[PDB]
């Protein structure tokens, strides 16, 4: 469909979410949904980003990958409707 | 307990999440959990931020309030365990 889920594994450090989102912001690229959770007994966190499927997305995944504190960035290996399901409980 | 939920209503525009998180980042203030959802049939979105209960938080709520595209910022008027509940389904 229209959107894509990007799943990031990042270091749970101050400022990594600003850097990740700044890459999108610097291009006026909107982010539709965000879920961020720490990983249990770990120094990392998971970031799920709901974004529109885009030609520019492949280049931006590359920028995200080179970021500081980002260890892995995945496209479309998560739950495609995960934000619809969360939305049933939070509005 | 240790943490606090900040609930923001913001314009669903590119770059607002970068600005919101940059205020925390500029102070090395960590953000523990994030949920961001668009509001149905609307031009806004909701941002829930899980942060440590802090003396500096009252000043930073003030900075967040003066931000561009932020219409409302609330402290502790949401679900205190909301990220624990999401965590049962997403890790
Ligand atoms: C958290 C997403 C916010 C509302 C906006 N869409 C942005 O790209 O910054
Ligand atoms: C999304 C939160 C990330 C992992 C980090 N805690 C930060 O403050 O930017
Ligand atoms: Co670091
Ligand atoms: Co705007």
From Swiss-Prot, chains A, B:
Its EC number is 2.2.1.6. Residues 5-78 form the ACT domain. PROSITE patterns: ACT. InterPro entries: Acetalactate_synth_ssu (IPR004789), ACT-like_dom_sf (IPR045865), ACT_dom (IPR002912), AHAS_ACT (IPR039557), AHAS_small-like_ACT (IPR054480). GO terms for biological process: branched-chain amino acid biosynthetic process; isoleucine biosynthetic process; L-valine biosynthetic process. It catalyses: 2 pyruvate + H(+) = (2S)-2-acetolactate + CO2. This is Acetolactate synthase isozyme 1 small subunit. Gene3D superfamilies: 3.30.70.260. E.coli contains genes for 3 AHAS isozymes: ilvBN, ilvGM and ilvIH. The gene is ilvN. Belongs to the acetolactate synthase small subunit family. NCBIfam families: PRK08178.1 (NF006036). Keywords: Amino-acid biosynthesis, Branched-chain amino acid biosynthesis, Transferase. One of its GO terms (molecular function) is acetolactate synthase regulator activity. It comes from the Bacteria. Pathway: Amino-acid biosynthesis; L-isoleucine biosynthesis; L-isoleucine from 2-oxobutanoate: step 1/4; Amino-acid biosynthesis; L-valine biosynthesis; L-valine from pyruvate: step 1/4.
């Amino acid at each position: 469909h229209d959107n894509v889920i990007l799943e990031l594994t990042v270091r749970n450090h101050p400022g990594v979410m600003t850097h990740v989102c700044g890459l999108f912001a610097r291009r006026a690229f909107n982010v539709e949904g965000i879920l961020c959770l720490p990983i249990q007994d770990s120094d990392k966190s998971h970031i799920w980003l709901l974004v529109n499927d885009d030609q520019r997305l492949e280049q931006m995944i590359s920028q995200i990958d080179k970021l500081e504190d980002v260890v892995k960035v995945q496209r479309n290996q998560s739950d495609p409707t995960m934000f619809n399901k969360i939305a049933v409980f939070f509005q």
